[PDB]
């Protein structure tokens, strides 16, 4: 089972991620059967004129 947690909290800072206690609630329990050993995050670029 692949567990995913999430807790969206508003903040206002540039860098130096602030301090504070957070409680991430469970989101999904996808029943998969793969051997996860490596991951890679994805982002979005900006194409314009």
């Amino acid at each position: 089972y692949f567990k995913i947690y999430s807790k969206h909290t508003p903040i206002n800072l540039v860098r130096d991620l602030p301090q504070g206690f957070s409680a991430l609630e469970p989101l999904v329990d996808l029943p998969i059967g793969i051997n996860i050993t490596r991951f890679q995050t994805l982002l979005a670029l900006h194409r314009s004129y």
């Binding site: 089972y1 029943p31 998969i32 059967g33």
Partner: protein
């Protein structure tokens, strides 16, 4: 084959189900019955867990 022929010439919609289990978490399960929720009485309860 024609509509009127022998016994060994009639169509047969054959579906061969194959129940197979792997190391992955099982998802294809069966229905679970539900009784009536009796309150204010010394009875037994059988929830999910």
């Amino acid at each position: 084959f024609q509509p009127t022929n022998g016994v060994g010439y009639q169509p047969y919609r054959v579906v061969v189900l194959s129940f197979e289990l792997l190391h992955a978490p099982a998802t294809v399960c069966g229905p679970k019955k539900s009784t009536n929720l009796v309150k204010n009485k010394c009875v037994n309860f059988n929830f999910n867990g």
